[PDB]
Amino acid sequence: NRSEVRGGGRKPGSIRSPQWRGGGVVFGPTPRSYSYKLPKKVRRLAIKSVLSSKVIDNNIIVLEDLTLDTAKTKEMAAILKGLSVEKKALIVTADANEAVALSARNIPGVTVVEANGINVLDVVNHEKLLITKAAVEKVEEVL
Amino acid sequence: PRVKGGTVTRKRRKKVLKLAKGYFGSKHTLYKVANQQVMKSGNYAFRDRRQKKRDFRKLWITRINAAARMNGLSYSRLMHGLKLSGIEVNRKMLADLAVNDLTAFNQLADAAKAQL
Amino acid sequence: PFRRTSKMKKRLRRTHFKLNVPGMTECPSCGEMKLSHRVCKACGSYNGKDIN
Amino acid sequence: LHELKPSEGSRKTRNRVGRGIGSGNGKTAGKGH
Amino acid sequence: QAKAVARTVRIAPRKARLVMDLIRGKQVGEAVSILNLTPRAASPIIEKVLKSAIANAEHNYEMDANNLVISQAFVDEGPTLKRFSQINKRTSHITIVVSEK
Amino acid sequence: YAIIKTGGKQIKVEEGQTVYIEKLAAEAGETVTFEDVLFVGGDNVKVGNPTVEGATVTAKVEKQGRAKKITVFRYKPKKNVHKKQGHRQPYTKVTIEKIN
Amino acid sequence: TPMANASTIERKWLVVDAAGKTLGRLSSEVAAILRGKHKPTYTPHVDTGDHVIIINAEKIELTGKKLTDKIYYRHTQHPGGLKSRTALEMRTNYPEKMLELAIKGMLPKGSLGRQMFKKLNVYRGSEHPHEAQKPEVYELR
RNA sequence: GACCGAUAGUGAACCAGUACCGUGAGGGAAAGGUGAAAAGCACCCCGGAAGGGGAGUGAAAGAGAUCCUGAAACCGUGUGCCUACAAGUAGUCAGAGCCCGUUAACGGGUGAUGGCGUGCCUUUUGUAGAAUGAACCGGCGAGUUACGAUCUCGUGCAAGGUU
RNA sequence: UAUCCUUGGGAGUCAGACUGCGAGUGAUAAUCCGUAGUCGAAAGGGAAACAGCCCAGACCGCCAGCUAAGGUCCCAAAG
RNA sequence: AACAGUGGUAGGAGAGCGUUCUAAGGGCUGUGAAGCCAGACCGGAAGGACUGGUGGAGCGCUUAGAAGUGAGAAUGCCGGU
């Protein structure tokens, strides 16, 4: 600022002014934070809608139980080959399947999501969604 | 963020110091006095697209007035009879571009005294 | 002064500032160029007799 | 998400002062003389 | 063609342009003999440069040291040193380009 | 050689010479023929009674486009007045054959 | 697009006698010939005029009581030293000057205003030594 | 890190609270960049040396020690066109002559000569002013941040809305 | 002939200048009651030059056409 | 499609172009990128694009949210002349 600059008080008006090169900036951005909020009614009526874009273009793909045995990332590349999904994707599983979460984190395109932690963003970016059917019954209960 | 902006000032000051290309003295290098004689040289060039519309008139009249003194008529006497008898709406330019050809002018000059 | 001078009134004040070629002749001894009416620096002789 | 076009008449460019002579309010920034 | 730059020999580059006005169109032997006949303070500096300008050509291009003539003789301002009101000490680039006729 | 006054100031046109007429429609590539011949000349058929009867000039429409970009600047002596505008003026080139 | 001449101008040579005409009445018709107003081709920056020779300048006359009234002033660069003269002495001691002074006022001012004045030739008596150009007589229209 | 990138960010990216200034309390700077590598110029030539020209190194010496890129003011040297009878906010329309060939276009550069033409910004009832301000170039340099009021717009729900 | 009410948002100015017409006045001389116009915020033509006078209102081109005030020997367009 | 209209400071309203940045995509660059210098092109303005030289590591484009602002004037400040 002009005041928190290690500057002089005497006339050389002052050696650390707005026009002076040795001084700081007049205005300038200060320690602030912008955190607004929608209503609760407008926070659960959109997660359906981005889901609703996906039922249109068959971007939803539903699987049963997300069958895994270990943490082999070679299996998931065969699974992405099996479901023929190419770019970024989603995985939603209701019970935090640890073989799923420990796998696929290194595969660059994909991500796994515990079913309560869905949000309006990752449905838009990852643009297709491998869902276990066991998680589908949960998501109507919260919304 | 912070925006320095150095690549946007010189390209805004070349295009003024290019339109001054050919002035006297310092007025094609210093930006501070090349901006005045661009803002004035667009101002004369509007004011003097109206005089060359009106100072080619004093050319064509002065040549017609000399080409009419071959037949005794002045300019006012000639144009007065050029609208009475003849129904032509000939320009004072195109009744002057034919001054070179005496035969042509003469023919049109004969009708002036026909209704005078 | 009252107002600075341009590049035109500056370069016109330097026509009567340049210097001229001094008088150079051909020594009769064994020189190439030397100021007239004087003793050469390299032979060091005058008229027709070296006085050095 | 590629072309997230906002609703028409929902946003408006913030008014500036002293950033143009023809834009308006630049000399005295619309604060009088 | 022969080139001899004297880089940052200490002379003010307006007192050195007053000596390069008679050696830009003269014959090469007829200029070196006129440099020693001048009382100019900064005359010896140019003499050395010229003498080195010939000897660059007649050794490395071998071009008949009584046929040459002086094409370009410019003097450029060089980096200055400022002392203490402030006194500048100017410098000079002197170059001479000699070619055949 | 005819003086034609079609859509603007009358112009002197001899045989075999291109001119520049204002933007009539003219369907560039086709022909056109004016109808307002004044003073077809040579044998001196005067312009008695508003344009010689029966006299036409056939022309071939050749090229349409614009002129050199005249950029009009304008400003007052004070009160922060500034105005700036470019202006390409349209034009039509026609060659000339067979004065009737 | 109109014709504008370019240094291809055949000057004639015209004799004008000032036998009983007036100063400003005869100088008002001469300075249109000098400027080239009477030619059918005429361009205001090319000087398409033509030479005139004036014979018997001392025969001129000016009306009214002007032969005692009109006083010619020629104030030099010296402040407080402005000379003055009349018009009776001017048309008698050297009547050349009176015509070429009053012509000079009616001509324009500038470069062509002093270029055109070089075409004027005013001699005394009634004889011009310019017969190698064969001028003809032109009366005042 | 929707932070800065050497006039910024701390005063300080570098032998900085240093150098300097002051008796003293105290004040308080300036200054980054060869190259992938040091391969940093064996030798020859002029010169007292500096500095050059060759030769070598290297992808580059136009990279040679304040060394990447290197703008502008300022200073130059060549070269096409004008200029030694001419009174001009220097320009602008008309305009030969002369020299040129383009992002091909009613081309480009100079312009003898004619017409018109009281700089710029701020301020005042009002400017040409001697009313104020600028030597020039370059950089930096002045209206929006959560907290409260009020209205417009957009949106959700709506006699129920909201944490 | 197309303007003016309401309500609400947002302001600016608060020493204007000069030239005329209806009552005076002042020295029936240069304030002032009224009212108009222009400039302020308005270029172009005319009055030699001219912020307030005369005519007139600039979207931008064109080497198109007639007029306003004012003008017609020459400078400078036209008897 | 015919009319009507377009001087303008204070001031009010509306429509736009640019400058850095982090990501959803899409795509050039060592056969030469930014930056720099040229140019006789394009758009109603702010401003864009293409060839040519110089440079030796990066940039950019319709699409959305933010902008430590886009300078000719401070008897501005630092540097250079």
Side-chain angles (χ1 to χ4, degrees), chain F residues 11-45 47-76:
Chain F
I11 293 143
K12 161 160 164 314
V13 178
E14 305 154 359
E15 180 41 77
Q17 154 190 10
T18 77
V19 286
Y20 294 130
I21 312 299
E22 324 296 320
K23 191 197 155 291
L24 75 162
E27 72 288 327
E30 265 80 344
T31 65
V32 78
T33 289
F34 300 134
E35 64 265 42
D36 293 330
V37 174
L38 293 98
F39 177 42
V40 76
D43 72 310
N44 202 269
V45 186
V47 70
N49 219 347
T51 78
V52 205
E53 281 73 25
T56 46
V57 183
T58 66
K60 310 201 168 179
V61 185
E62 196 166 5
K63 180 178 181 178
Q64 278 213 352
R66 65 180 207 86
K68 170 172 289 307
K69 199 204 201 81
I70 286 185
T71 69
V72 46
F73 202 97
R74 225 170 164 209
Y75 87 134
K76 296 297 289 137

Side-chain angles (χ1 to χ4, degrees), chain G residues 44-47 108-119:
Chain G
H45 63 266
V46 79
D47 192 3
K109 320 295 181 318
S111 93
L112 278 190
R114 67 174 56 84
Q115 166 81 31
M116 283 158 199
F117 185 74
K118 310 192 175 202
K119 308 206 210 65

Side-chain angles (χ1 to χ4, degrees), chain G residues 13-136:
Chain G
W13 276 70
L14 304 187
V15 168
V16 166
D17 206 327
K21 269 71 61 184
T22 334
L23 213 56
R25 286 229 188 275
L26 102 77
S27 65
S28 92
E29 277 308 342
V30 152
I33 302 301
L34 270 185
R35 191 170 142 85
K37 273 278 185 38
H38 89 295
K39 281 201 174 49
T41 166
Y42 163 68
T43 308
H45 63 266
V46 79
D47 192 3
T48 169
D50 45 349
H51 315 261
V52 293
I53 318 175
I54 293 182
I55 288 93
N56 319 323
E58 79 273 14
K59 288 297 185 179
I60 211 175
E61 49 201 336
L62 71 168
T63 49
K65 303 184 160 176
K66 285 170 163 164
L67 276 154
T68 326
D69 200 351
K70 194 189 177 198
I71 289 177
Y72 286 91
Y73 294 113
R74 47 179 191 201
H75 183 265
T76 173
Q77 265 6 254
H78 278 278
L82 58 97
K83 348 236 177 164
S84 154
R85 25 199 71 232
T86 71
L88 179 58
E89 316 188 17
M90 181 146 278
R91 70 155 285 174
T92 44
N93 289 24
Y94 36 96
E96 297 280 60
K97 195 85 164 191
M98 201 181 52
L99 264 177
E100 60 199 271
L101 192 56
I103 285 290
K104 182 169 167 130
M106 303 179 185
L107 276 161
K109 320 295 181 318
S111 93
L112 278 190
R114 67 174 56 84
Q115 166 81 31
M116 283 158 199
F117 185 74
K118 310 192 175 202
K119 308 206 210 65
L120 183 74
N121 295 264
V122 288
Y123 307 91
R124 242 197 249 193
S126 166
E127 245 120 40
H128 61 285
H130 297 242
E131 321 161 3
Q133 269 73 24
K134 318 155 306 304
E136 69 264 8

Side-chain angles (χ1 to χ4, degrees), chain A residues 5-8 10 16 21 26-27 32 39-42:
Chain A
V5 153
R6 199 173 207 189
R10 59 211 203 86
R16 307 300 175 100
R21 163 238 226 240
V26 208
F27 286 173
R32 89 246 265 293
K40 274 186 76 43
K41 275 296 193 29
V42 196

